[PDB]
Amino acid sequence: DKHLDTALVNAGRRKKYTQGSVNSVIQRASSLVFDTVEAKKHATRNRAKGELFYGRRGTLTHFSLQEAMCELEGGAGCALFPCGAAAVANTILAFVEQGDHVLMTNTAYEPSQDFCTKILAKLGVTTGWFDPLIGADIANLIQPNTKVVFLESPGSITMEVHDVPAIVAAVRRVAPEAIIMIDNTWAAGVLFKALDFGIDISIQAATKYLIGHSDGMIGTAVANARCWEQLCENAYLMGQMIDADTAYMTSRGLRTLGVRLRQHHESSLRVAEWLAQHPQVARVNHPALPGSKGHEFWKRDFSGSSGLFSFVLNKRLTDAELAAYLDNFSLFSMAYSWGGFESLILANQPEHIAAIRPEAEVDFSGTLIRLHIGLENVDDLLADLAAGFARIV
Amino acid sequence: DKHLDTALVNAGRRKKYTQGSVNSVIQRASSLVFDTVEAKKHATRNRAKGELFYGRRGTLTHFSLQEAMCELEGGAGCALFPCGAAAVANTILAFVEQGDHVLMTNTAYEPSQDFCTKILAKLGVTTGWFDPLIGADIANLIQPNTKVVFLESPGSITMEVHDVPAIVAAVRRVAPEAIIMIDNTWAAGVLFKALDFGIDISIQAATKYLIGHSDGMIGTAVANARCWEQLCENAYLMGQMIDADTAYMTSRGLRTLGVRLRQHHESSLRVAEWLAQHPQVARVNHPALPGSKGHEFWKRDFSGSSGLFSFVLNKRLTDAELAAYLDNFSLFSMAYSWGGFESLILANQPEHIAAIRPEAEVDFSGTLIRLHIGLENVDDLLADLAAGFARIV
Amino acid sequence: KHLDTALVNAGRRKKYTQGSVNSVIQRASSLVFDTVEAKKHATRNRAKGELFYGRRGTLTHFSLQEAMCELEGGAGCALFPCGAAAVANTILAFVEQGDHVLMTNTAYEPSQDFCTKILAKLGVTTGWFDPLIGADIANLIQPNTKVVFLESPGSITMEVHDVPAIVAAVRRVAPEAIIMIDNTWAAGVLFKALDFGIDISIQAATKYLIGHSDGMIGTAVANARCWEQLCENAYLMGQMIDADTAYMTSRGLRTLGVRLRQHHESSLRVAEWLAQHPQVARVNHPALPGSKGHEFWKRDFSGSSGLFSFVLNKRLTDAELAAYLDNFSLFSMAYSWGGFESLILANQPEHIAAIRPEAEVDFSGTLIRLHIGLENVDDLLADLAAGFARIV
Amino acid sequence: KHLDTALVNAGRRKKYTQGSVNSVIQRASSLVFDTVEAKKHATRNRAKGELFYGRRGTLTHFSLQEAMCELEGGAGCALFPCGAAAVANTILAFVEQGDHVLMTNTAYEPSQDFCTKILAKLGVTTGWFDPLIGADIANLIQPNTKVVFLESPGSITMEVHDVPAIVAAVRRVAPEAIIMIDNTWAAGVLFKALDFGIDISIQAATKYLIGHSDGMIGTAVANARCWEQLCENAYLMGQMIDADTAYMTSRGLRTLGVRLRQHHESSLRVAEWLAQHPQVARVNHPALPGSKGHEFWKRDFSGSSGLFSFVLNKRLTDAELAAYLDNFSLFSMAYSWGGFESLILANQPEHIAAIRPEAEVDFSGTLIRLHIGLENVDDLLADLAAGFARIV
Numbered sequence A, B: 001d002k003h004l005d006t007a008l009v010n011a012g013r014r015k016k017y018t019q020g021s022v023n024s025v026i027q028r029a030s031s032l033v034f035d036t037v038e039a040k041k042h043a044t045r046n047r048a049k050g051e052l053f054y055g056r057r058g059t060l061t062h063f064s065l066q067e068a069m070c071e072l073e074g075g076a077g078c079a080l081f082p083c084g085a086a087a088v089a090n091t092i093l094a095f096v097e098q099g100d101h102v103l104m105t106n107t108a109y110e111p112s113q114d115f116c117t118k119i120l121a122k123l124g125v126t127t128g129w130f131d132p133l134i135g136a137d138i139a140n141l142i143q144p145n146t147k148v149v150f151l152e153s154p155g156s157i158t159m160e161v162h163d164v165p166a167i168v169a170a171v172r173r174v175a176p177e178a179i180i181m182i183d184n185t186w187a188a189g190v191l192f193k194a195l196d197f198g199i200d201i202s203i204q205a206a207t208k209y210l211i212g213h214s215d216g217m218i219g220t221a222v223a224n225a226r227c228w229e230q231l232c233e234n235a236y237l238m239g240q241m242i243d244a245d246t247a248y249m250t251s252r253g254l255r256t257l258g259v260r261l262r263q264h265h266e267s268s269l270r271v272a273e274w275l276a277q278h279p280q281v282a283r284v285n286h287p288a289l290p291g292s293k294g295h296e297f298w299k300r301d302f303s304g305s306s307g308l309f310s311f312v313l314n315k316r317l318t319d320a321e322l323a324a325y326l327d328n329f330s331l332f333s334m335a336y337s338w339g340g341f342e343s344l345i346l347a348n349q350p351e352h353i354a355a356i357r358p359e360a361e362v363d364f365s366g367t368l369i370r371l372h373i374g375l376e377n378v379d380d381l382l383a384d385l386a387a388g389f390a391r392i393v
Numbered sequence C, D: 001k002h003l004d005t006a007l008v009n010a011g012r013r014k015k016y017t018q019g020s021v022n023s024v025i026q027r028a029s030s031l032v033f034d035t036v037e038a039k040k041h042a043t044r045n046r047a048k049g050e051l052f053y054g055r056r057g058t059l060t061h062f063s064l065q066e067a068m069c070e071l072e073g074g075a076g077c078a079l080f081p082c083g084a085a086a087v088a089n090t091i092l093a094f095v096e097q098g099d100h101v102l103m104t105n106t107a108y109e110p111s112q113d114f115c116t117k118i119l120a121k122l123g124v125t126t127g128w129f130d131p132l133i134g135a136d137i138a139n140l141i142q143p144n145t146k147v148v149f150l151e152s153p154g155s156i157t158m159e160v161h162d163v164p165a166i167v168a169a170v171r172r173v174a175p176e177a178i179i180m181i182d183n184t185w186a187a188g189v190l191f192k193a194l195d196f197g198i199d200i201s202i203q204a205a206t207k208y209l210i211g212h213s214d215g216m217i218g219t220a221v222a223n224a225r226c227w228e229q230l231c232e233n234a235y236l237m238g239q240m241i242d243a244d245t246a247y248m249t250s251r252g253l254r255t256l257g258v259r260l261r262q263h264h265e266s267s268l269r270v271a272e273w274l275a276q277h278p279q280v281a282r283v284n285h286p287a288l289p290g291s292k293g294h295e296f297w298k299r300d301f302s303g304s305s306g307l308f309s310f311v312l313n314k315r316l317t318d319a320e321l322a323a324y325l326d327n328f329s330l331f332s333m334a335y336s337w338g339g340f341e342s343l344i345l346a347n348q349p350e351h352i353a354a355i356r357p358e359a360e361v362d363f364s365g366t367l368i369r370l371h372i373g374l375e376n377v378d379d380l381l382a383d384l385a386a387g388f389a390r391i392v
């Protein structure tokens, strides 16, 4: 939006939270003190509605972040979690019961899949899978006991973009009361306005772009009015919360999210365009790159891109080639996570990807390189990638 | 132990964590960088064994705390959680599946009960209850599908102490492979060496005495070798972790835990002795006070007391009397939680207690006052309590 | 071509990061010596990045110090509780009874007050110069002039020095004088002071380095000639910063390039728009043509930040000042700058005259200082336009 | 009867805590004024606890300042990056060219070095006195003596002043002199300096107030006569502490009483045991009978902390120093003190002589300084006994 940067700078900032400073105060607390029985009664009644009650419900610092997330993502409430994986697992758990069925994209984050197959399965909840490009044909997979439809767009690692309008419309035709969820981390919740598309809950690893500096972990889940109270109370029954200081740092990260994302978009698309012309590259998976799976949906449904994408090499690198390649970069660092200022590089063997694509078939045989494009000078990053190519030519 | 204070000062402090300082470093991270493919392979193999892999598994700061908790509580591993309630809920969840049965003391922390009745019940796991003084007679409640026996000693609010040796021995006779758990928060994990008694897992709201200052929330679960790997991996599948700074503050709280607990013991027992002689007091629930329920077990099985206890007034105070009493204390603060330097006061109506004692009957009709005795001068606290009594005489 | 890469990587060595992207936070007073020989080695190297005592620093400070030295091209970086402490203690480190300080009359007011209220009673005199004096500063250098203190752009009124002409003139008369600059507006990276022959570059890292209005810290990066005296005399005054703020300063560096580019783009737009506005008499922005010293900014800087000022076409009454300043929707009234929030402050001409020693001001309208943050510039323009309508 | 209650409650008002037990942490440079009138009011009250600018403080600092004033009985509390900064800047706030400072020759070495290496070149002279001089200090007061600087117990050698006799003597000759004390060993609460007619009580809050060896901060609590000058001259040098360390200092206060009682009990036991040991020539513990000034400690203090020293029955060789110090299991070799960890340091007699201006030392054995932490005292005794066996 033409006002997103203004919204990012101001979200969640009310005087009761900031008390004269630009940023919210950091209120560290378990105990929250009631001056009177009447104040305790009021706090108890409103213990889930932004009145100070107990640290597990939140302090002023959490309330400020929650207000900011609800403004930016257009929700009725925002639940907070110790990390992105906890947000996914506990948001699903909040809405299933024995006998229910979960329908999840087979490009979902691997720990999200493992939560379903290793935790939910033993509790009486089953999981089916769908191709990210299934579109309207997802109506054929919905069962009488299907309670949750779980999206992730772009998909993890391989970056396939859903046709969310087609998927949502099909779901609402067959099972209108289904809970549609999305892991919206890649878009940082702001490049894809999930709730505006009829999705019920938008989950983020705020660990990534919201924190923005690779030094804090936190999950968020913003729900519409229909689903908020069940999410809030069931997640609370699991004790899910984040510490006040990380909440403060997430609010703080919001303030620069627009400037950062614009640079990640510009730099990563430039890199992807170069890779797509490169003799040692077989495929480029960047939602903003014409030709990538689901690109047309990204162009239609997103307001921008972030900096995480991947590409396929011309070959399945051996262990020895992978070391020659990855061990000798000067700028890219080998690490998990993404969304920070540091450019990162991560390799996945085609067979490794096949193993996390349930009931699907991988359509590449070269090693998949996932890049996070950070804030470095893009020409320096290209030179680093070029040196890597020369080590394996 | 005659060396507990020395152990508390030194636990978890190895050079790889402290790097020259007295306290561990604070390493804030999601991304942890691998210098080489060989280093990444080593990190992956040992990602649950204290090698840096990914922030969700921990940084140096978490590893230091985990080592400290395992030393002090005599366990094989320590899982970390965003708060005490999350530790309880996810430690139980890590070991049950559809069709299992949980046997829990009916004096358990109310959110622990609610996790069982509102979350587990809809996932196919049932919960039965037992009186805290059931002792060896608990063998009669164990069912072929009973997987978890959940203790809490002293109990929440009413402070009844289990006969843990009797309970454990009975459980091992009937269902030797049962997972015995205890919420050991009141003892701060160190006044009752749960694992030495044959309990499998010792859970704490480190929020309380370990943090020690009412300004940080965190849960811990220390497991023996038999149960560690299931606890660790299933809790991780739920995304459970704590932030690095709170881990640092928990290690830091350990260093003064002995001096603090000795003062909480001395002051709270003095207060309890006075209350037990008081014309406006009907009953005193302090494990260290002769006559309290389970006291003989506390004397035999614990190495000390903390500062949390409760007493029963001569009457069920009306709302108006409760305000006259609680609104006008000068030192005691009305708040939830405990284990800090501030003395706290909290009232529970006898009928409120009855409502959180499933399949049991309350044996008092006066208002129950729970006190946390902090680090204030004990005579000032007695004067505050005396003024309170005069307001309701 | 490379500043953004340098900002991302500065100060990051494994001994400081230990596996993470950012340096570890090592909170410490006591630092433990395993042996007498280790203690002797730490003592010898207590100003050279071996752990010795928290007042000298921990790994977190060492990482920031290395980053600042790399980015500003210096031999060492002293750390301070705030920018004002960096200014006061850096000057103090190089003067003694009988010395003379020559300071631009556009210096930050607390810097001036340090000179007139602290240094003077300790036997150090201060004289003043117009910021556009250029080579004619040679005529003001006295036999006892020890420090020449620059600030470019100047505080509030934003005049840009001709640093090459000033430095050449100083070195002709007093080759060994200590030339210092408060380089906060450039965040130490838009103007590479040490490459111009300045000896010490001082920053309120509070501003753009922290970048979020929520941490205070001063830095002073010195060349090889001046470092040891700066380091040891600041240490004798106990000057340090806490490890956590040091960490947050290193962390701020990483986004400094992308932030500054936005502040530049937006503040230049606003300045160009104000320059055309009928209710504006003059715009003081280093990057705007016609502003005092603009030609030196264009020649000597690699960019602009977001702080500047303008003069209204009239002197506002007290009622008009309240109507104007009390009713902005986005601009906040506050001191400091360099964050994501846009800020506004007002000064009457006589207020500025009072902090322009031996000079008069050349305007009569109310002066407005703006910090242009990261909001959408069109929203900021609409906020300013609404303000103009309240005083028209 | 009430210190523990005071420590738990000091500085805690709803405007600072806003519902929590501890004060909020307000990180800020910029503090926002909603209106011109609010800005005027904040400006008027910028040293009196109205939010104005982060260099003056936020709510977190105000809470700590109120706590320190309540606990030490003062009119205001200035905050500094560390103890050495508090000492240096508190002295500097009250001197000018031509003044004379009279300091105990047992002062902390960096305090002495500030005087001889910074003040001297700024026209301020420093003279010295034996810590047991008592009323005879009157003979050392010069017409230009402005500051009398006490430290009781003394650094390392632990001599306790007769503060009533010193203060009475000073006030007879120079009633308006500024009497200051470095009151770190007493943590400001075991010796209520301002009640004895001292004007300013300075602490390295780094030590027992923080209490965990992981934060650095200085404080100076002044009476009504001296506060404004302290406050404003320290502010002109930019002296402040970050909000987070201020929070951690308030937090440390809450356990200070229970910690100090353990440090007292354990360090007195160790001192009594060392005094009986055949390899110990002398024990310097304020609470131990026979120690220099013990009678004044017993009369004037309400307790002891855990730092003291002793003299070995011989001068250790370099080989014996390594054998002794390199092989402790619990005691760590490090600077600072006041935490939960027990610490050990050694000094030869000539090292102490070098920091005893105009005095000679009266011992020839190696001096060992111990900080007694929170470990089990019998384990610490076993550690010390093993050390004795390594040098016997």
Ligand SMILES: Cc1ncc(COP(=O)(O)O)c(CN[C@@H](C)C(=O)O)c1O
Binding pocket: A083, A084, A085, A086, A088, A109, A156, A183, A185, A186, A204, A205, A206, A207, A208, A217, A218, A219, A335, A336, A337, A338, B030, B056, B239
């Ligand atoms: C899409 C997505 N969802 C959830 C998560 C989990 O968030 P936390 O790491 O905060 O629990 C991640 C992190 N995946 C990282 C580790 C990666 O792709 O390397 C993710 O990429």
Ligand SMILES: Cc1ncc(COP(=O)(O)O)c(CN[C@@H](C)C(=O)O)c1O
Binding pocket: A030, A056, A239, B083, B084, B085, B086, B088, B109, B156, B183, B185, B186, B204, B205, B206, B207, B208, B217, B218, B219, B335, B336, B337, B338
């Ligand atoms: C025994 C016990 N277990 C678990 C918890 C939950 O820990 P967290 O609050 O960190 O989630 C509490 C806190 N009960 C507090 C709130 C009380 O008794 O007031 C507790 O007392």
Ligand SMILES: Cc1ncc(COP(=O)(O)O)c(CN[C@@H](C)C(=O)O)c1O
Binding pocket: C082, C083, C084, C085, C087, C108, C155, C182, C184, C185, C203, C204, C205, C206, C216, C217, C218, C334, C335, C336, C337, D029, D055, D238
């Ligand atoms: C140019 C300049 N130098 C130094 C400082 C002092 O830094 P600290 O505030 O960290 O001590 C400031 C702060 N000026 C703010 C207050 C302003 O211009 O409003 C400044 O603008």
Ligand SMILES: Cc1ncc(COP(=O)(O)O)c(CN[C@@H](C)C(=O)O)c1O
Binding pocket: C029, C055, C238, D082, D083, D084, D085, D087, D108, D155, D182, D184, D185, D203, D204, D205, D206, D216, D217, D218, D334, D335, D336, D337
């Ligand atoms: C008495 C005394 N005053 C002031 C200070 C200075 O405090 P900072 O270290 O916070 O600047 C110290 C520190 N003395 C430590 C270093 C010691 O005696 O080893 C001290 O012991």
Ligand SMILES: N[C@@H](CCCC[NH3+])C(=O)O
Binding pocket: A010, A013, A014, A015, A016, A018, A019, A020, A021, A022, C329, C330, C331, C332, C341
């Ligand atoms: N009034 C808001 C700030 C408004 C910000 C305008 N940019 C607060 O008190 O936090």
Ligand SMILES: N[C@@H](CCCC[NH3+])C(=O)O
Binding pocket: B010, B013, B014, B015, B016, B018, B019, B020, B021, B022, D329, D330, D331, D332, D341
């Ligand atoms: N060697 C340990 C400290 C030993 C502490 C003895 N009290 C470390 O490096 O952290």
Ligand SMILES: N[C@@H](CCCC[NH3+])C(=O)O
Binding pocket: A330, A331, A332, A333, A342, C009, C012, C013, C014, C015, C017, C018, C019
């Ligand atoms: N080797 C450096 C990191 C290099 C960063 C490359 N972008 C460290 O250990 O911190």
Ligand SMILES: N[C@@H](CCCC[NH3+])C(=O)O
Binding pocket: B330, B331, B332, B333, B342, D009, D012, D013, D014, D015, D017, D018, D019
């Ligand atoms: N009223 C105080 C707390 C009183 C504390 C009583 N022990 C506050 O709001 O912080």
